[PDB]
Coordinates of C-alpha atoms and ligand atoms in Angstrom, one line a residue:
Chain A
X1 CA 40.0 6.1 17.4
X2 CA 40.8 9.3 15.5
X3 CA 39.4 11.2 12.5
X4 CA 38.7 8.1 10.4
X5 CA 36.2 9.5 7.9
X6 CA 36.3 12.5 5.6
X7 CA 36.5 16.1 6.7
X8 CA 35.2 18.7 4.3
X9 CA 34.0 22.3 3.9
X10 CA 30.5 23.1 2.6
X11 CA 29.5 26.6 1.6
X12 CA 25.7 27.4 1.6
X13 CA 24.0 30.7 0.8
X14 CA 22.2 32.4 3.8
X15 CA 18.8 31.6 2.2
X16 CA 19.2 27.8 1.8
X17 CA 17.6 24.4 1.4
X18 CA 18.1 23.1 5.0
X19 CA 16.4 19.7 4.5
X20 CA 14.3 17.7 2.1
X21 CA 12.5 14.3 2.2
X22 CA 11.5 12.2 -0.7
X23 CA 8.7 9.7 -0.7
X24 CA 7.2 7.5 -3.3
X25 CA 3.7 6.0 -2.9
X26 CA 1.9 3.7 -5.4
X27 CA -1.4 2.4 -6.6
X28 CA -2.4 -1.3 -6.2
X29 CA -0.4 -2.6 -9.3
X30 CA 2.4 -0.1 -9.1
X31 CA 1.5 1.3 -12.5
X32 CA 1.0 4.8 -11.0
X33 CA 3.2 6.7 -8.6
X34 CA 3.3 10.0 -6.7
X35 CA 6.7 11.5 -5.7
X36 CA 6.2 13.7 -2.7
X37 CA 9.0 16.1 -1.9
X38 CA 9.0 18.2 1.3
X39 CA 11.4 21.0 1.3
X40 CA 12.6 23.0 4.3
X41 CA 14.5 26.3 4.2
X42 CA 16.5 28.6 6.5
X43 CA 17.2 32.3 6.0
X44 CA 14.8 35.1 5.2
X45 CA 11.4 34.3 3.7
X46 CA 10.4 36.4 0.7
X47 CA 7.3 36.0 -1.5
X48 CA 9.5 35.8 -4.6
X49 CA 11.2 32.7 -3.3
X50 CA 10.4 29.4 -5.1
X51 CA 11.2 25.7 -5.0
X52 CA 11.1 23.6 -8.1
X53 CA 11.4 19.8 -7.8
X54 CA 12.0 18.0 -11.1
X55 CA 12.3 14.3 -11.7
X56 CA 14.7 12.9 -14.3
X57 CA 14.9 9.4 -15.8
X58 CA 18.3 9.6 -17.4
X59 CA 18.6 12.7 -19.6
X60 CA 14.8 12.8 -20.0
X61 CA 12.8 15.1 -17.7
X62 CA 9.9 13.0 -16.3
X63 CA 8.2 15.7 -14.3
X64 CA 8.6 19.1 -12.6
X65 CA 6.7 21.2 -10.1
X66 CA 7.1 24.7 -8.6
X67 CA 5.6 26.5 -5.7
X68 CA 6.4 29.3 -3.2
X69 CA 7.0 28.5 0.4
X70 CA 4.2 27.9 2.8
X71 CA 2.8 24.5 3.7
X72 CA -0.8 23.3 4.5
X73 CA -2.4 24.1 7.9
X74 CA -1.0 21.8 10.6
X75 CA -2.7 22.9 13.8
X76 CA -4.4 25.8 15.6
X77 CA -1.4 28.0 15.0
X78 CA -1.2 27.4 11.3
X79 CA 1.5 25.6 9.3
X80 CA 5.1 25.8 8.3
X81 CA 5.8 29.1 6.4
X82 CA 9.3 27.9 5.9
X83 CA 8.4 24.6 4.1
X84 CA 6.7 23.4 0.9
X85 CA 5.7 20.0 -0.4
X86 CA 5.8 19.3 -4.1
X87 CA 3.8 16.4 -5.5
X88 CA 4.6 14.8 -8.9
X89 CA 2.7 12.1 -10.8
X90 CA 4.7 9.4 -12.5
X91 CA 3.0 6.9 -14.9
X92 CA 4.4 3.4 -15.1
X93 CA 7.5 4.2 -13.0
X94 CA 10.5 1.9 -13.5
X95 CA 10.6 0.2 -10.0
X96 CA 13.8 -0.1 -7.9
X97 CA 15.0 -3.4 -6.5
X98 CA 18.2 -5.3 -5.9
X99 CA 17.4 -7.3 -9.1
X100 CA 17.1 -4.1 -11.3
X101 CA 18.3 -1.0 -9.5
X102 CA 16.4 1.5 -11.7
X103 CA 17.1 5.0 -10.5
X104 CA 15.7 8.4 -11.1
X105 CA 17.4 11.7 -10.2
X106 CA 15.5 14.3 -8.2
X107 CA 16.7 17.9 -8.3
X108 CA 15.6 20.4 -5.8
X109 CA 16.0 24.1 -6.8
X110 CA 15.8 27.0 -4.5
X111 CA 15.3 30.1 -6.7
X112 CA 13.6 33.4 -7.2
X113 CA 10.4 33.9 -9.2
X114 CA 12.3 35.5 -12.1
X115 CA 14.2 32.3 -12.5
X116 CA 17.5 33.1 -10.7
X117 CA 18.9 30.0 -9.1
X118 CA 20.0 30.4 -5.5
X119 CA 21.2 26.8 -4.9
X120 CA 20.4 23.2 -5.7
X121 CA 20.5 19.9 -3.9
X122 CA 19.7 16.4 -5.3
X123 CA 19.6 12.7 -4.7
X124 CA 19.0 9.4 -6.4
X125 CA 15.4 8.2 -6.3
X126 CA 14.3 4.5 -6.3
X127 CA 10.7 3.8 -6.8
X128 CA 9.9 0.9 -4.4
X129 CA 7.5 0.2 -1.6
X130 CA 8.5 -1.7 1.6
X131 CA 5.7 -3.0 3.7
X132 CA 4.9 -5.9 6.0
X133 CA 1.5 -7.5 5.3
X134 CA -0.2 -10.7 6.6
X135 CA 3.2 -11.6 8.1
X136 CA 5.4 -11.1 5.0
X137 CA 8.0 -8.5 4.1
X138 CA 7.0 -7.2 0.7
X139 CA 9.0 -5.1 -1.8
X140 CA 6.7 -3.7 -4.5
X141 CA 4.1 -6.2 -3.4
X142 CA 6.4 -9.2 -3.6
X143 CA 7.7 -11.3 -0.6
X144 CA 11.5 -11.0 -0.3
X145 CA 14.0 -13.7 0.3
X146 CA 16.9 -12.0 2.0
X147 CA 20.3 -13.4 0.9
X148 CA 22.2 -11.0 3.1
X149 CA 25.4 -10.7 5.1
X150 CA 26.6 -8.5 8.0
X151 CA 29.5 -6.2 7.0
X152 CA 31.8 -4.2 9.2
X153 CA 33.9 -1.3 7.8
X154 CA 37.3 -2.9 8.1
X155 CA 40.5 -2.7 6.1
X156 CA 43.6 -4.8 7.0
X157 CA 46.0 -1.8 6.6
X158 CA 43.8 1.2 7.1
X159 CA 41.7 -0.2 10.0
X160 CA 38.3 1.4 10.0
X161 CA 38.9 3.9 7.2
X162 CA 36.8 3.2 4.1
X163 CA 37.6 4.0 0.5
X164 CA 35.5 3.6 -2.6
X165 CA 37.7 1.0 -4.3
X166 CA 37.2 -1.3 -1.3
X167 CA 33.5 -0.6 -1.1
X168 CA 33.1 -1.5 -4.7
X169 CA 35.3 -4.6 -4.4
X170 CA 33.1 -5.8 -1.5
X171 CA 29.9 -5.0 -3.5
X172 CA 31.0 -6.9 -6.6
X173 CA 32.1 -9.9 -4.6
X174 CA 28.7 -9.9 -2.8
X175 CA 26.6 -9.7 -5.9
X176 CA 28.9 -12.2 -7.7
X177 CA 28.1 -14.6 -4.8
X178 CA 24.4 -14.2 -4.9
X179 CA 23.9 -11.8 -2.0
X180 CA 21.1 -9.2 -2.3
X181 CA 21.3 -7.6 1.1
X182 CA 23.7 -6.1 3.6
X183 CA 23.3 -5.1 7.2
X184 CA 25.4 -2.2 8.6
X185 CA 26.6 -4.0 11.7
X186 CA 26.4 -2.0 13.9
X187 CA 26.4 1.6 13.0
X188 CA 25.7 4.1 10.1
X189 CA 28.2 3.5 7.3
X190 CA 30.4 5.8 5.4
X191 CA 28.0 7.9 3.2
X192 CA 29.3 6.6 -0.1
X193 CA 28.2 3.1 0.9
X194 CA 24.5 4.0 0.5
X195 CA 25.1 5.6 -2.9
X196 CA 26.7 2.4 -4.2
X197 CA 24.0 0.2 -2.8
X198 CA 21.3 2.4 -4.5
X199 CA 23.2 2.1 -7.8
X200 CA 24.4 -1.5 -7.7
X201 CA 21.3 -2.8 -6.0
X202 CA 21.4 -4.2 -2.5
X203 CA 18.8 -4.1 0.3
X204 CA 20.3 -2.4 3.3
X205 CA 19.5 -2.5 7.0
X206 CA 20.6 0.9 8.4
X207 CA 21.6 0.5 12.1
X208 CA 21.9 3.1 14.8
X209 CA 25.3 3.2 16.5
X210 CA 24.2 1.8 19.8
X211 CA 25.7 -1.2 21.5
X212 CA 26.0 -1.7 25.3
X213 CA 26.7 -5.5 25.2
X214 CA 29.2 -5.2 28.1
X215 CA 26.7 -4.0 30.7
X216 CA 25.0 -6.2 33.4
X217 CA 22.2 -6.8 32.7
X218 CA 22.5 -5.8 29.0
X219 CA 19.7 -3.2 29.2
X220 CA 21.0 -1.4 32.2
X221 CA 21.5 1.7 30.1
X222 CA 18.8 1.3 27.5
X223 CA 16.1 1.1 30.2
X224 CA 17.5 4.2 31.9
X225 CA 15.7 7.5 30.9
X226 CA 18.9 9.4 31.6
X227 CA 20.4 7.7 28.6
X228 CA 17.4 8.3 26.4
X229 CA 18.7 11.6 25.0
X230 CA 22.0 10.2 24.0
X231 CA 20.4 7.1 22.4
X232 CA 17.8 9.2 20.5
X233 CA 20.4 11.2 18.7
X234 CA 22.1 8.1 17.5
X235 CA 18.7 6.9 16.0
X236 CA 17.3 10.3 14.9
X237 CA 20.4 11.7 13.2
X238 CA 20.8 8.4 11.3
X239 CA 17.3 8.7 9.9
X240 CA 17.7 12.4 9.1
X241 CA 20.8 11.5 7.1
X242 CA 19.8 8.3 5.1
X243 CA 16.0 8.5 4.8
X244 CA 16.2 9.4 1.1
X245 CA 18.2 6.3 0.2
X246 CA 16.0 3.7 -1.6
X247 CA 18.6 0.9 -0.8
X248 CA 17.7 1.3 2.9
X249 CA 14.5 -0.8 3.4
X250 CA 14.8 -1.4 7.2
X251 CA 15.8 0.7 10.2
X252 CA 17.6 -0.9 13.1
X253 CA 17.7 0.5 16.7
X254 CA 21.1 -0.9 17.1
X255 CA 22.6 -4.1 18.5
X256 CA 23.0 -6.1 21.7
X257 CA 21.8 -3.6 24.2
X258 CA 19.2 -5.8 25.7
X259 CA 15.7 -4.4 25.6
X260 CA 14.8 -1.2 27.5
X261 CA 12.1 1.4 27.5
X262 CA 14.3 3.8 25.4
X263 CA 14.1 1.2 22.6
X264 CA 10.3 1.3 22.6
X265 CA 10.3 5.1 22.5
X266 CA 12.8 5.4 19.6
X267 CA 11.0 2.5 17.8
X268 CA 7.8 4.5 17.9
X269 CA 9.6 7.7 16.9
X270 CA 10.8 6.1 13.6
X271 CA 7.4 4.6 12.8
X272 CA 6.0 8.1 13.3
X273 CA 8.5 10.1 11.1
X274 CA 9.0 7.4 8.5
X275 CA 6.2 4.8 7.9
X276 CA 7.9 3.7 4.7
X277 CA 10.4 1.3 6.3
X278 CA 9.9 -1.4 8.8
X279 CA 11.8 -1.1 12.1
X280 CA 13.7 -4.0 13.7
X281 CA 15.9 -4.8 16.7
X282 CA 17.2 -8.1 18.2
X283 CA 17.9 -7.2 21.8
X284 CA 15.8 -8.6 24.6
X285 CA 14.8 -11.8 22.8
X286 CA 14.5 -10.9 19.1
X287 CA 10.7 -10.6 19.3
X288 CA 10.1 -7.7 21.7
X289 CA 7.7 -4.9 21.2
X290 CA 10.4 -2.8 19.6
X291 CA 10.7 -4.9 16.4
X292 CA 8.4 -5.4 13.4
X293 CA 10.5 -8.4 12.4
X294 CA 11.5 -11.4 14.4
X295 CA 15.3 -11.0 13.9
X296 CA 17.2 -13.4 16.1
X297 CA 20.9 -14.1 15.9
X298 CA 22.1 -17.7 15.6
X299 CA 18.7 -19.2 16.2
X300 CA 19.0 -22.7 14.7
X301 CA 16.7 -24.4 12.1
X302 CA 15.2 -27.3 14.1
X303 CA 17.0 -27.2 17.4
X304 CA 15.7 -25.0 20.3
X305 CA 18.1 -23.2 22.6
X306 CA 15.7 -22.5 25.6
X307 CA 18.0 -19.9 27.3
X308 CA 16.2 -18.2 30.3
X309 CA 14.4 -15.0 29.4
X310 CA 15.9 -14.7 25.9
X311 CA 15.7 -18.2 24.4
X312 CA 16.6 -18.8 20.7
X313 CA 13.8 -20.9 19.4
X314 CA 14.1 -23.0 16.3
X315 CA 13.1 -20.5 13.6
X316 CA 10.5 -22.8 12.2
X317 CA 9.0 -23.1 15.7
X318 CA 9.4 -19.4 16.5
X319 CA 7.0 -18.4 13.7
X320 CA 4.1 -20.4 15.1
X321 CA 4.5 -19.5 18.8
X322 CA 1.0 -18.8 20.1
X323 CA -0.1 -15.3 18.8
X324 CA 3.0 -14.7 16.7
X325 CA 2.4 -13.3 13.1
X326 CA 5.5 -11.5 12.1
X327 CA 8.1 -12.5 9.4
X328 CA 11.4 -13.9 10.6
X329 CA 14.7 -12.8 9.2
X330 CA 17.8 -13.6 11.1
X331 CA 19.9 -10.4 11.7
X332 CA 22.9 -12.8 12.1
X333 CA 23.4 -16.5 11.3
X334 CA 25.9 -19.1 10.1
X335 CA 28.9 -17.8 12.0
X336 CA 31.7 -18.0 9.4
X337 CA 34.6 -18.2 11.9
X338 CA 37.5 -20.3 10.4
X339 CA 36.5 -23.6 8.9
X340 CA 32.8 -23.0 9.2
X341 CA 29.3 -22.6 7.5
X342 CA 28.6 -26.3 8.2
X343 CA 24.9 -26.7 7.9
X344 CA 24.3 -23.6 5.8
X345 CA 22.1 -25.7 3.4
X346 CA 19.7 -26.5 6.2
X347 CA 18.9 -22.8 6.6
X348 CA 18.1 -22.3 2.9
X349 CA 16.0 -25.4 2.6
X350 CA 13.8 -23.9 5.4
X351 CA 13.8 -20.4 4.0
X352 CA 12.4 -21.8 0.7
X353 CA 9.9 -24.1 2.4
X354 CA 8.5 -21.5 4.9
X355 CA 7.0 -18.3 3.5
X356 CA 7.5 -16.3 6.7
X357 CA 11.1 -17.4 7.0
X358 CA 12.5 -14.8 4.7
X359 CA 16.3 -15.3 4.9
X360 CA 18.9 -13.6 7.0
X361 CA 22.3 -11.9 7.2
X362 CA 25.4 -14.2 7.6
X363 CA 28.0 -13.2 10.2
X364 CA 29.9 -12.0 8.6
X365 CA 31.6 -10.6 5.4
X366 CA 35.3 -10.2 6.2
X367 CA 37.9 -11.2 8.8
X368 CA 38.8 -8.3 11.1
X369 CA 42.5 -9.3 11.0
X370 CA 45.2 -6.7 10.9
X371 CA 48.6 -6.5 9.1
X372 CA 51.8 -6.6 11.1
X373 CA 55.4 -7.1 10.0
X374 CA 58.2 -9.3 11.3
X375 CA 61.9 -8.5 11.5
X376 CA 62.4 -9.2 7.8
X377 CA 59.5 -6.8 7.2
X378 CA 57.2 -9.5 5.9
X379 CA 53.4 -9.1 6.5
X380 CA 51.3 -11.4 8.6
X381 CA 47.7 -11.3 9.7
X382 CA 47.2 -10.5 13.3
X383 CA 44.3 -10.7 15.7
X384 CA 43.3 -10.1 19.3
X385 CA 46.3 -9.7 21.5
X386 CA 48.9 -9.4 18.8
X387 CA 49.3 -5.7 19.9
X388 CA 49.9 -6.1 23.6
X389 CA 46.2 -5.3 23.8
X390 CA 44.7 -6.9 26.9
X391 CA 42.5 -8.3 27.8
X392 CA 41.4 -9.3 24.3
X393 CA 39.3 -12.0 22.6
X394 CA 42.0 -13.4 20.3
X395 CA 40.7 -14.7 17.0
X396 CA 37.0 -14.1 17.5
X397 CA 37.4 -10.9 15.4
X398 CA 37.7 -13.2 12.3
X399 CA 34.4 -14.7 11.2
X400 CA 34.3 -13.6 7.6
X401 CA 33.4 -15.3 4.3
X402 CA 36.5 -13.6 2.9
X403 CA 40.0 -12.8 4.3
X404 CA 40.8 -9.2 5.3
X405 CA 42.3 -8.8 1.8
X406 CA 39.1 -10.1 0.2
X407 CA 40.5 -13.5 -0.9
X408 CA 37.5 -15.8 -0.5
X409 CA 37.3 -18.4 2.2
Chain B
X1 CA -18.6 -36.0 18.2
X2 CA -19.0 -36.1 14.5
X3 CA -22.1 -35.7 12.3
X4 CA -23.1 -38.7 10.1
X5 CA -22.2 -37.0 6.8
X6 CA -19.8 -38.3 4.2
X7 CA -20.2 -37.9 0.5
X8 CA -16.6 -39.0 -0.4
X9 CA -17.8 -40.7 -3.6
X10 CA -19.2 -37.5 -5.2
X11 CA -17.4 -35.7 -7.9
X12 CA -16.2 -33.2 -6.9
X13 CA -16.5 -34.2 -3.2
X14 CA -18.6 -31.1 -2.3
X15 CA -21.2 -31.6 -5.0
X16 CA -23.9 -32.3 -2.4
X17 CA -22.6 -30.2 0.5
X18 CA -22.4 -27.1 -1.6
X19 CA -25.9 -27.7 -2.9
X20 CA -28.6 -25.8 -1.0
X21 CA -31.1 -28.5 -1.8
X22 CA -29.2 -31.0 0.5
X23 CA -29.0 -28.5 3.3
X24 CA -32.1 -29.8 5.1
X25 CA -30.9 -33.4 5.1
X26 CA -27.5 -32.2 6.3
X27 CA -28.6 -29.9 9.1
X28 CA -30.6 -32.7 10.7
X29 CA -27.5 -34.9 10.9
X30 CA -25.8 -32.0 12.6
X31 CA -28.6 -30.4 14.7
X32 CA -30.0 -33.7 16.0
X33 CA -26.5 -34.8 17.0
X34 CA -25.9 -31.7 19.1
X35 CA -29.4 -31.8 20.8
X36 CA -28.6 -35.4 21.9
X37 CA -25.0 -35.2 23.1
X38 CA -24.6 -31.6 24.2
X39 CA -24.7 -32.5 27.9
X40 CA -21.9 -35.1 27.9
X41 CA -18.7 -33.6 29.4
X42 CA -16.5 -36.1 27.5
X43 CA -17.5 -34.4 24.2
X44 CA -15.2 -31.4 23.7
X45 CA -15.3 -30.9 20.0
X46 CA -18.1 -31.0 17.4
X47 CA -17.3 -32.3 13.9
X48 CA -19.4 -31.5 10.8
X49 CA -18.7 -34.9 9.3
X50 CA -16.0 -36.3 7.1
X51 CA -14.8 -36.3 3.5
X52 CA -17.6 -34.3 1.8
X53 CA -15.4 -31.5 0.4
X54 CA -16.3 -28.0 1.6
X55 CA -19.7 -26.6 0.6
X56 CA -21.7 -23.6 1.7
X57 CA -23.8 -26.0 3.7
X58 CA -20.8 -26.6 5.9
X59 CA -20.5 -22.9 6.7
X60 CA -24.2 -22.5 7.6
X61 CA -24.1 -25.5 10.0
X62 CA -20.7 -24.5 11.4
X63 CA -22.3 -21.2 12.3
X64 CA -25.4 -23.0 13.7
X65 CA -23.3 -24.9 16.2
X66 CA -21.3 -21.8 17.2
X67 CA -24.7 -20.2 17.9
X68 CA -26.5 -22.9 19.9
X69 CA -23.4 -24.2 21.8
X70 CA -20.5 -21.7 22.4
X71 CA -18.9 -24.2 24.8
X72 CA -17.2 -26.4 22.3
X73 CA -14.9 -25.7 19.3
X74 CA -16.2 -26.8 15.9
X75 CA -13.9 -28.7 13.4
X76 CA -14.1 -30.1 9.9
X77 CA -11.3 -31.4 7.6
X78 CA -13.1 -31.3 4.2
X79 CA -12.0 -28.9 1.5
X80 CA -8.4 -28.4 2.8
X81 CA -8.3 -28.9 6.6
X82 CA -8.3 -25.2 7.1
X83 CA -11.4 -23.7 5.6
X84 CA -13.8 -21.2 7.3
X85 CA -15.9 -24.1 8.6
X86 CA -13.3 -25.2 11.2
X87 CA -11.8 -23.7 14.4
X88 CA -9.0 -26.2 14.2
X89 CA -6.6 -27.0 11.4
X90 CA -7.4 -30.7 11.2
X91 CA -5.7 -32.4 8.3
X92 CA -5.7 -36.1 7.7
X93 CA -2.3 -37.7 6.9
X94 CA -0.3 -34.4 6.7
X95 CA 3.3 -35.3 7.3
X96 CA 5.7 -33.8 9.8
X97 CA 8.4 -32.3 7.5
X98 CA 7.4 -33.1 4.0
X99 CA 4.8 -31.1 2.1
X100 CA 2.4 -32.7 -0.4
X101 CA 1.4 -29.7 -2.5
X102 CA -1.7 -31.2 -4.0
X103 CA -3.7 -28.8 -6.1
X104 CA -6.5 -27.0 -4.3
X105 CA -6.3 -29.1 -1.1
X106 CA -2.6 -29.6 -0.3
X107 CA -1.3 -31.3 2.8
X108 CA 1.5 -29.2 4.1
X109 CA 4.1 -30.3 6.6
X110 CA 2.2 -29.7 9.9
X111 CA 5.1 -27.6 11.2
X112 CA 4.8 -25.3 8.1
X113 CA 1.0 -25.3 8.1
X114 CA 0.9 -23.5 11.5
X115 CA 2.9 -20.5 10.3
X116 CA 1.4 -19.9 6.8
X117 CA 0.8 -16.1 6.4
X118 CA -2.1 -15.1 8.6
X119 CA -2.7 -18.6 10.2
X120 CA -3.2 -18.6 13.9
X121 CA -5.3 -21.8 14.7
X122 CA -4.2 -24.8 16.6
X123 CA -3.5 -27.9 14.5
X124 CA -4.7 -31.4 15.5
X125 CA -4.7 -34.1 12.8
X126 CA -8.1 -35.7 12.6
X127 CA -6.3 -38.6 11.0
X128 CA -2.6 -39.6 10.9
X129 CA -0.2 -42.6 11.2
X130 CA -2.2 -45.1 9.0
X131 CA -1.9 -48.4 10.9
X132 CA -2.6 -50.6 7.9
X133 CA -0.8 -53.9 8.4
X134 CA 2.9 -53.7 9.3
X135 CA 2.9 -50.0 9.8
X136 CA 3.3 -47.0 12.2
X137 CA 6.7 -46.3 10.8
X138 CA 7.8 -42.7 11.6
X139 CA 5.2 -42.4 14.4
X140 CA 7.9 -41.1 16.8
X141 CA 8.5 -38.3 14.3
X142 CA 4.9 -37.0 14.9
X143 CA 5.3 -36.9 18.7
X144 CA 8.7 -35.1 18.7
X145 CA 7.0 -32.4 16.7
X146 CA 3.8 -32.4 18.9
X147 CA 6.0 -31.9 22.0
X148 CA 8.2 -29.2 20.5
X149 CA 5.5 -27.0 18.8
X150 CA 2.9 -25.6 21.2
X151 CA 0.3 -25.3 18.4
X152 CA 0.8 -28.8 17.3
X153 CA -1.5 -30.4 19.9
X154 CA -1.5 -34.1 18.7
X155 CA -3.9 -36.1 16.6
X156 CA -6.1 -39.1 16.2
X157 CA -4.4 -42.3 14.9
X158 CA -6.2 -44.2 12.1
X159 CA -7.4 -46.3 13.5
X160 CA -8.5 -48.5 16.4
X161 CA -9.6 -51.9 15.2
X162 CA -9.3 -53.8 11.9
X163 CA -12.8 -54.1 10.3
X164 CA -12.4 -57.8 9.5
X165 CA -15.4 -60.1 9.6
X166 CA -15.5 -63.7 10.7
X167 CA -16.2 -66.5 8.2
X168 CA -16.0 -70.2 8.5
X169 CA -14.4 -72.9 6.4
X170 CA -15.9 -76.3 5.5
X171 CA -14.5 -77.7 8.7
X172 CA -16.4 -75.0 10.5
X173 CA -13.3 -73.2 11.5
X174 CA -13.3 -69.4 11.7
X175 CA -11.0 -67.0 9.7
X176 CA -10.8 -63.2 9.2
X177 CA -12.3 -61.9 6.0
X178 CA -12.2 -58.6 4.2
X179 CA -13.3 -56.8 1.1
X180 CA -14.6 -59.2 -1.5
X181 CA -14.7 -62.2 0.7
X182 CA -18.5 -62.2 0.6
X183 CA -18.9 -62.1 -3.2
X184 CA -19.2 -58.3 -2.6
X185 CA -18.0 -56.6 -5.7
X186 CA -16.7 -54.1 -6.5
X187 CA -14.7 -53.9 -3.2
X188 CA -11.5 -52.5 -1.8
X189 CA -10.2 -55.7 -0.4
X190 CA -8.1 -55.2 2.7
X191 CA -8.3 -51.4 3.1
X192 CA -11.0 -52.0 5.7
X193 CA -8.2 -53.2 8.1
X194 CA -6.2 -50.3 9.4
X195 CA -6.2 -50.8 13.1
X196 CA -3.8 -51.0 16.0
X197 CA -5.6 -54.1 17.2
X198 CA -7.3 -57.1 15.4
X199 CA -11.1 -57.3 15.3
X200 CA -11.0 -59.5 18.4
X201 CA -9.0 -56.8 20.1
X202 CA -5.7 -58.7 20.1
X203 CA -2.9 -56.0 19.8
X204 CA -0.9 -55.4 16.6
Ligands
LIG1 NA1 10.5 -18.1 2.8
LIG2 NA1 33.1 -12.3 16.4
LIG3 NA1 2.2 -29.3 21.3
LIG4 NA1 -9.3 -47.6 5.4

């Protein structure tokens, strides 16, 4: 607990850019693209007010558009006077992917007609399309093969406080070890994490900070409408914050909270506000109505685990269950606790043989061990219980591919 | 119940079945079969024939059956085991785990076939486990899969009885003969014997 992330002060003018969304749609062969930027403002509306959105590829200005506030007609009462949408054409855009993280810079200027700048915001733009079609997860029209890993924000000395050096160290090790995807288990990450993923190139699964694993049954809260408001904020505020990051290709409703009605509502909410990214969730059986992706955790390759109500079918078998058509990407697999990862090769032989088996995220990146000191003041890695903490789960907090200090296992 | 239509020897295999001029001859082999056996309850599936590739004539006749008799699924293996002329994925000799990515008409591992993008049909091998001579090795592998995968609903072993013919020696004693034993040439010798039982029905 505590104030574990940054604290800062931001000054904004009264008339300000209060929000902006960036979308990139393409033609059949991705040789043409349209960048759509919706800008929202707060403060007093004046006719002289303007918004200019310009697109930059390095130091070269690719495109620019300007318009006063006032959107199209929405309904019987009109439209948003306090909003404006700028559309920009881009010929042969350099597409974004984990393979080649091509990025553009979008600058949003709030200014007066005479050209006086009021304020400006901006973000990195990655031209890529994510869509599920005929059962496959496609990135720019190509079927992905997720070589991902689950990663908690953990430091052996600083606990759950993240710093750039560590984020970069993790990112370099991941890419150096052929990983192209990371899942934010199980909450929105420190903001810098998304910037690095956009620039270094990693497919990200952004996950809402919702986990009620300890309840009985697991969905006791998620199925309760009285907890819908609290849950919605955890999902809605995540989207409002990271929706402009191209590295985010999938939204997650959270983790291990069974399956409740609140999940279906929030699932539909996202699809409605952001059709650019698939939505997934493992609770309630990995294939409920709240997920566009069959995303089981620890489902084996050939062996079925017929647990009542929430069985973990062999992934090969799961795909062909009567009526099933969705792609299957394990949100978690190959539990790397201690001397582990035995049988890893079996998963990859299946991923490559089956088109709809599109990889998964290993559990997990780094041991959640902590640093303690003995009488002589020498450091030693501690785990559950080594703090008087009780009850606890001992060493189950260590299931990483690397040690807490990043030395590889 | 299968129509009497096989043009295996053609090159390509669908040369006659994709030819509108052979449609008349083909439709009779299909239409007259249905008019004769449509009342038997034991018949649960209509088959458009065997090894004749996949031609437009297969589609027309497939649609004909679906029209005159909507009580039975229609299947046909030609052209890839999963064309538009079959309600059932019915490959012949597709293996349980190993793919055989032949060009145009591959034989995928049956487990994989079921889940190819967009596929939703049940899969029943029209031919599998070739019982030629000392064979049936790996048979148990098929049944483990059939029982584990709901959409893998079995198959038809190939085949029941060796097609050997009786011949007699100078002492008038009988012996089992096969391809070429009657001066018949060219022939394919013993490939006519692929059964689980001998021609006299003695078990293998
Ligand atoms: Na695959
Ligand atoms: Na654990
Ligand atoms: Na079955
Ligand atoms: Na034969």
